[PDB]
Amino acid sequence: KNPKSDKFKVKRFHHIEFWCGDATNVARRFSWGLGMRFSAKSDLSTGNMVHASYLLTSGDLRFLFTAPYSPSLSAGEIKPTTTASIPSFDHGSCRSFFSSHGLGVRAVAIEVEDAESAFSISVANGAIPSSPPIVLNEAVTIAEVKLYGDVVLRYVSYKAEFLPGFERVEDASSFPLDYGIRRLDHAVGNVPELGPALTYVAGFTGFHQFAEFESGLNSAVLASNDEMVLLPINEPVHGTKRKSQIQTYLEHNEGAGLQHLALMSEDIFRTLREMRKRSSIGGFDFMPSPPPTYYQNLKKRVGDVLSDDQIKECEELGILVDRDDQGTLLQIFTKPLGDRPTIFIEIIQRVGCMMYQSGGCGGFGKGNFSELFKSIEEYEK
Amino acid sequence: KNPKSDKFKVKRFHHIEFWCGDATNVARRFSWGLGMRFSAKSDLSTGNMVHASYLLTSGDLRFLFTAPYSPSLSAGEIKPTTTASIPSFDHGSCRSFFSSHGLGVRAVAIEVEDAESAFSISVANGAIPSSPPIVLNEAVTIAEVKLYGDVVLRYVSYKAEFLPGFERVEDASSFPLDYGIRRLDHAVGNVPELGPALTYVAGFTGFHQFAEFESGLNSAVLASNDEMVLLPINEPVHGTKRKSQIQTYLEHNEGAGLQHLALMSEDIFRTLREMRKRSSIGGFDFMPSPPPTYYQNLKKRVGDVLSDDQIKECEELGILVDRDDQGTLLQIFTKPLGDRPTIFIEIIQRVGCMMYQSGGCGGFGKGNFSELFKSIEEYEK
Ligand SMILES: O=C(O)Cc1ccccc1O
Ligand SMILES: O=C(O)Cc1ccccc1O
Ligand SMILES: [Co+2]
Ligand SMILES: [Co+2]
């Protein structure tokens, strides 16, 4: 069931912020590789002497890329006189984050009704504060609490254009790329111990465990009331023949952090075609495809959902398919987005659970561990 | 004249190394924006636990992009047991460089006859050592001395494939991009004081001042014996109405460093067409074009070198033209390559000075300061 125990009003995923060494180059790579438009900036040209921040958008999906300038540019500033557009930014925290983790997600931001209420109630309920509520131009309130590792859960709330002090990019620089991605479906964290992580986060949010349906991990999923904010969390399982990829993550990331973002497409076939066309010319690479035996086995499992043509199209693109009690899930995983084997991206599309589509329709692919192992016995063939 | 006073045998520009926060994303951006192939790697997959290094090539042009992993991966190593493929790399120096300068060039590498000789003779003649000669796999010798700021001049010499411990990229990942760029023509440094910089560098190389032919800079050019290694150096001039861009550089870079790389194309028209097509989809932007009056004035200066059609093609692409006593220079400048207004790139092609083409044929564009100022009086039109 769903007890709907959110301790404050949570709306939707609002944006994801990457902390970078150079925001320009990461943003331009992601824009081409994923098909996202440059839509806002806050940097030297907008008066920001503290950080460079570039926003990419695709549908409702908002990726923010931020890097620090030299502290010398803003050395005479103090917090009351700051030119930073994101008041929680701090040169030392950002350099320390990036040197410790490399390229990765600093903030998972959700839109709430009242960011100040959400911050107070969260801290009242165990959340470790990270940046207190700050009202920007009497219009937007932002607050941050620790999520896991050095990742913050950022609350944003609007009285009624991204953030004050961001400018819309003059569209001579804004090329209308679009490969079909429309919103963030869920965000996945890796921790050394799942239980305490769950207890902490569920402790201060009231998010409930999302109901689900021997290789490497245990996981569980936290969800908001309407189950549109979904936050899976993994822990490693040790002693296994193949080393736990969760453990590999923790080693190369220097501890807990965000493992991957799941991006919903409105047409996963066109998204993967478009992304794969660009893999070797600046975009993203994809995990190796499952063997043909995996795809033959797809008819017996989802032959009622997908035509033979649609199945054959899943095979051309390397798409995985899983199915819940309520819907069917199409998914695929990129290779790591940067130098370290840490953060990656998953492209997904859900079919079923109409009534709008309810959140998590089809689950998260748990069934594909078994299906891929058994399929990999294609050595017989 | 040219006294040919090189104190050791210098061959050609060999490569440029960028020090990055994340080498993967910078390299993939540069590859698409400039049309360079992925040709070698040294990283986790090759046994390197210290740094990630990716090599892009176009003709003879070699761009190397390097970033540090977590020190924890190599904490049990010492220099005799290192897995780094570039023995001069050091986690602390790289993080300190990047935090101080942002994305930029760490090494200007030239190939010499004997890197050990070049290092000893240079230090004997005033060069500040940076990394002593090291022989890699009994095949390649590398040595580094300080050039200016935190930029090193790196010597490389081969007994007789980039460097030992680098693998050729398996070409499923190596897409044969090519927009016409073929080699590095010259590399430009900005310093606070030109005179001491010249005296130091000419002091330990024997490079001579390259003979040339009121807004912002003084500059001078150092050259090797056959004048194929060219190293211009700028200093700011203060008190000017418009602030010195050299000074702006020094402020945002936190001191002296490499200002820009000049890349020779074999077809500057195709290069700029191809680069401009990609400016807004992950590539590089170009400085704003000169006014039409600049291009009308081109007939009277280079009408004997370029047809009206070729001139009109210069106007479509924003190409600048200057002319020496010996040849004609076509040039254009990108906007900054990363977040800070520091490093950028120039695309060039030279016509004249046949006998092969002698180095610096057409100069470096000094004449375009005056031509652009006078051309900008198009307000009358
Ligand atoms: O970590 C993964 O590879 C995928 C994942 C993450 C979290 C919960 C369930 C799940 O299948
Ligand atoms: O700095 C620049 O913009 C161009 C330059 C650099 C160095 C020498 C001569 C010259 O025209
Ligand atoms: Co998932
Ligand atoms: Co130049």
Side-chain angles (χ1 to χ4, degrees), chain B residues 8 10-80:
Chain B
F8 42 90
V10 165
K11 280 161 79 184
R12 294 291 186 263
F13 277 124
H14 192 263
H15 66 269
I16 298 297
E17 177 173 21
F18 295 80
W19 265 2
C20 316
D22 184 88
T24 292
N25 274 269
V26 183
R28 270 177 192 234
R29 198 284 187 104
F30 276 57
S31 178
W32 176 236
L34 283 150
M36 311 178 67
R37 340 197 49 239
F38 268 85
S39 70
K41 60 175 176 175
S42 166
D43 66 359
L44 286 178
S45 74
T46 71
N48 189 338
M49 309 287 111
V50 172
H51 55 97
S53 283
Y54 302 110
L55 178 80
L56 302 185
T57 56
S58 194
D60 291 334
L61 181 62
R62 309 185 182 90
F63 277 3
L64 186 65
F65 305 84
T66 298
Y69 295 122
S70 168
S72 59
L73 302 190
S74 61
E77 296 175 16
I78 56 170
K79 264 170 181 187

Side-chain angles (χ1 to χ4, degrees), chain A residues 23-24 28 70 254 283 285 339, chain B residues 23-24 28 70 254 283 285 339:
Chain A
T24 292
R28 270 177 192 234
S70 168
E254 291 185 7
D285 304 335
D339 291 336
Chain B
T24 292
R28 270 177 192 234
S70 168
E254 291 185 7
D285 304 335
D339 291 336

Side-chain angles (χ1 to χ4, degrees), chain B residues 106-150:
Chain B
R106 164 66 173 181
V108 180
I110 58 168
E111 184 190 8
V112 298
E113 230 176 65
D114 179 339
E116 170 171 320
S117 296
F119 176 87
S120 296
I121 293 159
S122 290
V123 176
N125 281 273
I128 297 165
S130 185
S131 160
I134 288 126
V135 193
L136 312 161
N137 202 23
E138 295 161 52
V140 195
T141 301
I142 302 192
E144 305 177 6
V145 302
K146 299 192 184 204
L147 190 57
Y148 36 61
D150 291 331

Side-chain angles (χ1 to χ4, degrees), chain B residues 72-158 160 162-169 171-211 213 215-240 243-275:
Chain B
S72 59
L73 302 190
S74 61
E77 296 175 16
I78 56 170
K79 264 170 181 187
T81 65
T82 195
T83 51
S85 43
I86 305 174
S88 73
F89 183 85
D90 166 78
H91 291 276
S93 304
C94 181
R95 292 202 158 86
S96 175
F97 178 108
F98 191 93
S99 99
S100 159
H101 308 302
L103 175 64
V105 172
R106 164 66 173 181
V108 180
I110 58 168
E111 184 190 8
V112 298
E113 230 176 65
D114 179 339
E116 170 171 320
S117 296
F119 176 87
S120 296
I121 293 159
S122 290
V123 176
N125 281 273
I128 297 165
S130 185
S131 160
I134 288 126
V135 193
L136 312 161
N137 202 23
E138 295 161 52
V140 195
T141 301
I142 302 192
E144 305 177 6
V145 302
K146 299 192 184 204
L147 190 57
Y148 36 61
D150 291 331
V151 180
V152 300
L153 185 69
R154 165 182 290 152
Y155 305 132
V156 48
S157 61
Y158 296 81
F162 172 67
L163 286 175
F166 278 77
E167 296 185 5
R168 285 239 211 280
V169 169
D171 302 23
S173 324
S174 180
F175 192 105
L177 292 170
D178 178 10
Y179 313 158
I181 297 168
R182 288 297 176 260
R183 63 170 194 103
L184 177 70
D185 181 89
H186 59 269
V188 181
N190 282 347
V191 298
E193 322 195 315
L194 180 55
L198 277 188
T199 302
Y200 168 72
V201 176
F204 75 80
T205 62
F207 291 166
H208 62 280
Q209 177 147 3
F210 183 106
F213 73 66
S215 210
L217 62 88
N218 310 314
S219 47
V221 177
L222 281 178
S224 64
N225 276 3
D226 64 15
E227 298 181 323
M228 294 273 84
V229 173
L230 310 166
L231 298 174
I233 298 172
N234 306 322
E235 86 182 332
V237 162
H238 303 113
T240 71
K243 182 197 199 173
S244 185
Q245 61 284 328
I246 315 301
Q247 181 70 31
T248 296
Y249 175 99
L250 295 164
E251 280 159 20
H252 288 260
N253 198 62
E254 291 185 7
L258 185 139
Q259 173 191 74
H260 80 268
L261 310 153
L263 321 181
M264 173 262 172
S265 168
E266 73 167 7
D267 183 356
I268 194 173
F269 291 161
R270 157 164 142 276
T271 302
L272 268 285
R273 282 197 308 265
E274 291 306 306
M275 290 186 74

Side-chain angles (χ1 to χ4, degrees), chain A residues 59-73:
Chain A
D60 291 334
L61 181 62
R62 309 185 182 90
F63 277 3
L64 186 65
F65 305 84
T66 298
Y69 295 122
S70 168
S72 59
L73 302 190

